[PDB]
């Protein structure tokens, strides 16, 4: 399957079907987080996806070509997480991004808590453009999960 859109990353390795993560398809390239697939081949039912680019520190990996998504948060506007939960229908969750302060700069972060298998879900700006991926972040003082808006470079 080559059609653009959001996809589930599945494996029948477990008891039955198991969603290990989420990904997006854009311009013939499948984007997802690295910890999801560990940089492995992905069957598309009738198709095969070969790894092209990846980076562990960035926790990102693209298939069939280079990373295409280069839209970025403007630092003011609200965004929407396209959560694709394991076994649940995809839904838009709107929120105002938080901020990750690093020694290399500031990254956007969303305070939306979601289970394993949702990592790789798209975070969209007001125009629906993908400005980052959900699934990689920290746990604050309370025990609550905070994820960054991880964007790659085209």
């Amino acid at each position: 399957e080559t059609t653009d859109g959001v996809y589930r990353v599945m494996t029948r390795r477990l008891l039955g079907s198991t969603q290990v993560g989420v990904g997006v398809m854009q311009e013939g390239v499948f984007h997802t987080m690295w910890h999801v697939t560990k940089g492995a081949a992905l069957r598309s039912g009738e198709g095969r996806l070969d790894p092209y680019w990846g980076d562990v520190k960035q926790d990102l990996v693209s298939y069939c070509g280079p990373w295409k998504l280069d839209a970025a948060w403007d630092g003011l506007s609200e965004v929407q997480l396209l959560a694709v939960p394991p076994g649940e229908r995809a839904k838009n969750i709107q929120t105002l991004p938080g901020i990750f302060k690093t020694k290399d700069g500031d990254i956007g972060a969303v305070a939306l808590d979601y289970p394993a298998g949702t990592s790789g879900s798209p975070i969209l700006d007001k125009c629906g453009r993908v400005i980052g991926l959900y699934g990689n972040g920290v746990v604050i003082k309370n025990g609550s999960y905070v994820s960054a808006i991880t964007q790659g470079k085209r």
């Binding site: 959001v6 996809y7 589930r8 838009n92 938080g98």
Partner: protein, 38 residues
């Protein structure tokens, strides 16, 4: 071999439940891709 299957169209939904705070955190990223605090 892990496989993929479609989930839907990547679009914005005008009717969406708003939730989650907006914290500002000093974080650190290691070489192993794991985030951490300062």
């Amino acid at each position: 071999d892990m496989y993929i299957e479609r989930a839907g169209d990547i679009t914005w939904e005008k009717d969406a439940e708003v939730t989650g705070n907006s914290p500002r955190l000093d974080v650190a990223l290691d070489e192993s891709g794991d985030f951490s605090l300062v």
